[model samples]
Target chain A: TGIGTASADELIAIADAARGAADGEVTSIDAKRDGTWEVQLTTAAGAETEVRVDEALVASVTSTDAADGTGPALTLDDETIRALVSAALAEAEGMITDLDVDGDDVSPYDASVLTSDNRSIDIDFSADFAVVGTDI
Target chain B: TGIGTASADELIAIADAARGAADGEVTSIDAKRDGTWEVQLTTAAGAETEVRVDEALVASVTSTDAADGTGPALTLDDETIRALVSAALAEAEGMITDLDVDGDDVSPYDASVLTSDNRSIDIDFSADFAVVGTDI
Candidate 1:
């Protein structure tokens, strides 16, 4: 017999996308108490993240994830957090013009998200592990 | 023939009265090129002067004095002089203000004189003299 559940790969992908959008280096993620995830990150050089926990799910995730970072993770403003989540979840638009990649064009969506205004650009990536042994 | 004109003392006094009433300081009294008496004045820390030559015989005296405080002793703008002289000679309702002796309260007969924002506040204390004597 089998049961239905969310895909672990999907969750990992989402987390990776969020981390990239947030401009943080996600070092590790681990399991937590409430089917939630713990995400660990470091701000890009010269950049700092104002991390925010939007929902309880995300809050629990933040608690789990925060332990891995060297510095205490900052709580982002609610408005900024919502903006982040919106950016994370929403589909991105296509480029309108010929944008010089290394030029001063600072469209947050297309480029790696900046933790702060000119300090660092983050390239987000994530991974997931599933326990192989089951129902012994 | 009998008594040609007002004495310099009386002329200065009368001129001082008129000038003081209008927030002015009488600078000097002297004979003019036209063989008539002239009063040269600089206003109370003001930028320009009103030169009245032999007021007794004259029906009206008007001067629109202006200067950039450079070049000549005083420089009167043609347009400004024209406008000021027109108003002054015409006995316009709102031409000048009556000032106090102790330099405190200044009341304008035509309050518009004092209240006119467009009028030049650029008077010259370091002024020079000339007179255009006219007969009554």
Candidate 2:
């Protein structure tokens, strides 16, 4: 009885660790007949975290679930938002893409510091639209 | 046949001091023709500092008066150069003054960090242009 109890406790601990790695709270865990683990976790409000504690320790965590904010990335950062707005304004003004926030000397700001594998990237435009036309 | 020429030696000393100042080797008090005390300043070069000494304190100092080393101070800075180029381009392309860079977010990128008093500027556009497509 003591040996079985120890195995159960260890299995629960492994499931808990997997859920934590997914950045989610473990909602439920069930043991299968194959002696593997199944874990389900709910992310912090409006998010979902799912993980499978397979035979391997190398688990894949995906944050592709929608962010709490705007745009296609679950959350559009302030710099991105600003760039979007600037691009919209540029388009409305009939300015070229180079005159947008992705111009030669300018790039949109980004925020991907939360993720380890992610990177911060900005847009690039071709030219300066602001001073393109003045005299003629 | 005369008293010891202390006065001649004193005059020689004064001449030596003036020569040193003229050779850009020293800084000295400048007595102007208008009886004003001007501060004599030397060139950044090692040449004789024959330029006029005034209290302007290098308000305008340049080896050449023109930006291209040919014309005069017609404009203020590179932004002005940008404006002129934009104007010429506009004339060549038959473009109207679609944008004025005075009251927009187009801040000038001044290349100097220590001594440049860069001005904040922006872009102004003509009537809003129709958007042929949308990215939203």
Candidate 3:
């Protein structure tokens, strides 16, 4: 069905389940399309840890550092670029979840769009945003 | 602004980046909405490990599962169930990511749908699939 939010009780319970599985207080929890919950916890000492949980309440450490230290070389935070990509794709398509930059050996930019139609597709393009070939 | 897949060279280099970060042949690479890549790899010795990669090419180990492992409690593979939820939510939203079940003690079922509108929501329901409430 269409996308929706979680219930308070559900969050309370899931927060409890994740807390019981890992130490520290629950900070943030994000549901991933991979059928897992990315739960973050912070201890009194200010140390932070990330856990991946499943529907079974099965939880495990996914990353020790939530940020992992390094950041993206290019960010999709620019509405200007988003608007440009939308014009190229003819429809903003779905969401541009994956993106990369490489003006040299490969296409200047590469992006992945998860269509609402339930299929995931990839796009390759030049610096001018000219649509290249795509891969599924 | 939403979910999508990956391009070939993007996948190829990411697979290569993650493969270099970990000690195995690249297996699976999923682009996450959280701006990271869930890169999984397997060694010739039959050992499997997962890596989390950022656009900066920074990669780290997330998990190393090989044998029996805990997964989701329910499967979103049921089209009928998907259709049922779709009817309730008014739109087949974007994608259903997290889910759980109890059938008695708690809301029989719990799910998180990542809406196409750039927001994530959760839903609670009963055995009859009557939605109880939701949390965002």
Candidate 4:
């Protein structure tokens, strides 16, 4: 069993193998089309990065951009976003049903999730790490 | 002029009158159709709060709930949400054509806006100040 059909443990093994040591921990992983895997990780240096794995090899990695870049640089990382989501859910007693990063269409980057209480919450953060907005 | 038609300075005056000394700064103000003003403030103690001002009286105040509560408590004030939207627009070279907060029907607390680029962006943040999602 692997990322596509196996349990979380199976997915972790595949993701961990693809990431090696640079990727500190596999925070989350999802199986994508064509037997690919999207893995979100907390790096050894405490930074957040996302990678796409094909079989046992890392195909592409998406990390934060330089300080002075035209691209949309995320001010908050996956861990921070997850913590925020967990806190908000705790307030409403809502359980997380789904969680993932927003795709290219979203600006400034965002973590998107759906709660067990049938609520859809989106979070956006500032460069200063302050949550700037939430759309429920 | 009413809050809807009033300038930022006038809105500040109304907000200041309602909050008294504790409201250190009138960061942002929005006028609702019911003649109520949603005022965001940074208190003298450096904490954040939002108030619903009906006419000249503070009809209701919204502050962080107790650390241990089941109700949803927001982390970002209106000013911070507005600032995030502004920054997001700036990064994309987009312009804000309109802005407002989500109404009762909306699930997550959202800052809804229309950009000059003809895009509608709804931003959602968690209590810990991380953006969870954005609907574009």
Candidate 5:
């Protein structure tokens, strides 16, 4: 079987595959829900975060996560929040309430909205804080 | 630290060395008392048995063990036992009490001896059945 059924004796073989593919030392190993092993590695270049190994033991890099936030702005700025809310709450007739970010997880920021019609809304954003969709 | 202190994350690095050195898939791993890891492997040519990985992760094959016995004789044969016993009892005046071979361990054979002087002797032999030493 794969990582799910792997014994302690077999972990080294998988680590061997991932270490050679990533060209780095393994920092951690996690079993993903998708039936793959997530190998967190630290390389000489220091740019990579992790690699994914499939049941066949083939490995691929998964280090393309969004860049960390910069400058520590009090919020994502007035215009930034405007555009994000403008899209999701435009037709909903709402006002922005709270604006915050999820650290080390999920899309960058989520904007809470209060519609004038007394409906609650939450807007989803991309890594660049661009609007995507909303849950109303 | 050494293999005993090696984390699961570190086992791959050790396996990487042993696998590359032995050119095989590791069948088993054992922490040796001598501060090494015994990596038992099965190679392409199928001749190699294992390699030793040190605390530094350096690897060396330990496949120079004696060849397995042949012909399934009733014992190691009378002439063979004669030489093994002669070396240890040249001046001891001993008589053979038992002829037995140790399977897959230590020296190939040990001869139980009853000396004419009423002393007990136990003799060790090389893989080829040459005498090494004895306990008198």
Candidate 6:
């Protein structure tokens, strides 16, 4: 379970309502104890944005930034983060057969971690919930 | 270093030699501390083989049999496994934009973890280093 009682589908619906007409698909979602949820959206126009929400709903929505500057540091509940990670794997093109989410020294925010088998990659996300980068 | 201080190129060479005339590409490599390295090879005919090698080279090479029974319980050092995962991400036919390898509890051998930015999959490998299966 996530920090809050809201189901992932419910949170996703909140994010959709927040996006108005720019929405396409819910690419990913991350939840925080403060009720903040970082959601990634792929618009119909083929654009990506990270939307941060809370129990108050739709806290902030911003386009992906390529520059280097720290924004608000967002935190996600472990269960929520893992769920988002699972969603990402479902859409990968290649085969990803291994994932180890149980260890003493693991943090999704600190650095990108391996998700798939075969050839693997480490991914990093921004404080605002946007994908920061990936080390392939 | 992955397992036994072997270079990626060196591991590749060992895999090629083991495949003999059928060698195509060295798809994956996992190294264990016992000086054992599990190498996967794709043949020109599109056949796959899991090769186990040690300091002495070419311990055993066998094809994947998914019918029944556990094939081999392979082991890979953290560094080596991560390297192969990176390689997989680079050449993946699809876009893999997100990965989470760190958490309070994460393992490299239990389940599928890597997700694709576009498409996703879950992968698993045997203890002997052969790809067990993938959930697409």
Q: Give all candidate RMSDs, comma-separated.
A: 43.6, 38.9, 14.7, 27.6, 26.0, 28.5
Give per-residue CA lDDT, model 6, range B12-123, as digits (tens): 3444444443333444444444645555444434455555654321111111112232111222223434443444344343422222222112223322233334344554
Q: Any runs in candidate 5 off by more than 4 Å, and if so which?
A: A1-136, B1-74
Best lDDT among the predictions, by candidate number:
3
Please provide, for model 5 over B1-136, each residue's C-alpha lDDT reduced to its tens digit, 9 standing for 90 to 100: 2224213334454455565664434434445546555554443344334566653211112112122333222233334434544554453454444334532345666655565566667766667665676777
Fnat per candidate: 0.00, 0.00, 0.07, 0.00, 0.00, 0.00
Candidate 4 vs candidate 6: the TM-score winner is 6
Please tell me what DockQ candidate 6 reaches.
0.01
Candidate 3 runs further than 4 Å off: A1-10, A13-92, A102-106, B1-136
Model 1 CA deviation exceeding 4 Å by range? A1-136, B1-8, B17-22, B55-136
Candidate 6: segments with Cα more than 4 A from true spot: A1-136, B1-9, B57-136
Show model 4 residue runs off by greater than 4 Å.
A1-69, A75-109, A128-131, B1-136
DockQ of 5: 0.01
Error of 4 at A21 (Å): 22
Quote the lDDT for B52 in model 2. 30
TM-score of 5: 0.20
Q: What fraction of the real A-B contacts shows up in model 2?
A: 0.00
DockQ values, each candidate: 0.00, 0.01, 0.07, 0.01, 0.01, 0.01
Candidate 4 lDDT over residue span B23-53, tens digit each:
3344334445475555444433445455565
**Lowest lDDT 10-mer window, candidate 6 chain A?**
A56-65
- Rank ordering of all candidates by TM-score, starting from the highest: 3, 6, 5, 4, 2, 1
Provide the lowest-lDDT 10-residue window in model 4 chain A.
Answer: A56-65
Give the poorly placed runs of model 2, Cα more than 4 Å off.
Answer: A1-8, A56-136, B1-136
> Can you write out model 1's per-residue Cα lDDT over B16-71, one digit (the tens) per residue?
44354333333333333354333333332433333433332111111122332312
- Global lDDT for candidate 3? 0.50
Q: lDDT by residue for model 5 over A1-136, one digit each (tens)?
A: 1213213323344445566564434443445546555554444344334556554211112112232333222233334434444554553554444344432235566655565566666766666655666777
Model 2, span A28-55: residue lDDT tens: 3333346444444444342434444543
TM-score of candidate 2 chain A against the true chain A: 0.31
TM-score for chain B considered on its own, for each of the candidates: 0.27, 0.16, 0.38, 0.31, 0.35, 0.31
